[PDB]
């Protein structure tokens, strides 16, 4: 394996709009979230990172934060709530909020760069923007990649055209991380090496 073993315990929060979208059916939502996690786990296999779903929270009554059009603003409110409320329910390493919100600027996902394990900044916000589970899962994986210190693929640095960290998603989206991405992850493990992902569940 090119990389040493790491583990990311995810918390996934499904907002009220997404709950409504899926006919307020908890079972159906849980199945969809598990299928997403199985895809994130598959995509991280070449990075030697075992991905688990530590916690699933479905906002079946109302939104606990204002899930608004600006994704970065929503991410900050989510990181705050994650630190103050979600982490108190069960420890986990990274949390993503899934929503049906039509984020501004045609945004389908957003996350802080290189802040994996941070109590407030180890988060991403992702729009459930396709009926295709894989398309949403690869968006979750792209944001996870940013949180692991990855920037977008650059043709001078690597040749992959449809890898996970491509600057823009496409219909032909690949499930692979480019060499640009693997090199950024190596840099992250060497310079940041956060302790929470060294810990197996």
From Swiss-Prot:
Disulphide bridges, residue numbers: 117-196, 158-180, 160-163
Sites where the protein binds Zn(2+): 142, 146, 152
Function, as annotated: Potent fibrinogenolytic protease which cleaves mainly the Aalpha chain of fibrinogen (FGA) and slightly the Bbeta (FGB) and the gamma (FGG) chains. May possess hemorrhagic activity. Compared to other SVMP, the substrate-binding pocket is relatively shallow. Is less susceptible to tripeptide inhibitors than TM-1 (AC U3KRG1) and TM-2.
Organism of origin: Protobothrops mucrosquamatus (Taiwan habu)
Protein name (record): Snake venom metalloproteinase TM-3
Active site per UniProt: 143
Residue window of the full protein shown: 192 to 392 of 481
Lineage, broadest ranks: Eukaryota, Metazoa, Chordata, Craniata, Vertebrata
Entry binding sites for an L-amino acid tripeptide: 105-108, 166
Domain Peptidase M12B span(s) in chain numbering: 6-201
């Amino acid at each position: 394996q090119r990389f040493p073993q790491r583990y990311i315990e995810l918390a996934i929060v499904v907002d009220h709009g997404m709950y409504t979208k899926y006919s307020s059916n908890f079972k159906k939502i849980r199945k969809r979230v598990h299928q997403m996690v199985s895809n994130i786990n598959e995509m991280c296999r070449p990075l030697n990172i075992a991905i688990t779903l530590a916690l699933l929270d479905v906002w079946s009554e109302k939104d606990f934060i204002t899930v608004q059009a600006d994704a970065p603003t929503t991410a900050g409110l989510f990181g705050d709530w994650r630190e103050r409320v979600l982490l108190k329910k069960k420890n986990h390493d990274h949390a993503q909020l899934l929503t049906d919100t039509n984020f501004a600027r045609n945004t389908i996902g957003w996350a802080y760069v290189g802040r994996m394990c941070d109590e407030k900044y180890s988060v991403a916000v992702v729009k459930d923007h396709s009926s295709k589970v894989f398309m949403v899962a690869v968006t979750m994986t792209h944001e996870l990649g940013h949180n692991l210190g990855m920037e977008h693929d650059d043709k001078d640095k690597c040749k992959c055209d449809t890898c996970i960290m491509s600057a823009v998603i496409s219909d032909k989206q690949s499930k692979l991380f480019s060499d640009c991405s693997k090199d950024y992850y190596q840099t992250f493990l060497t310079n940041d090496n956060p302790q929470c992902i060294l810990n197996a569940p």
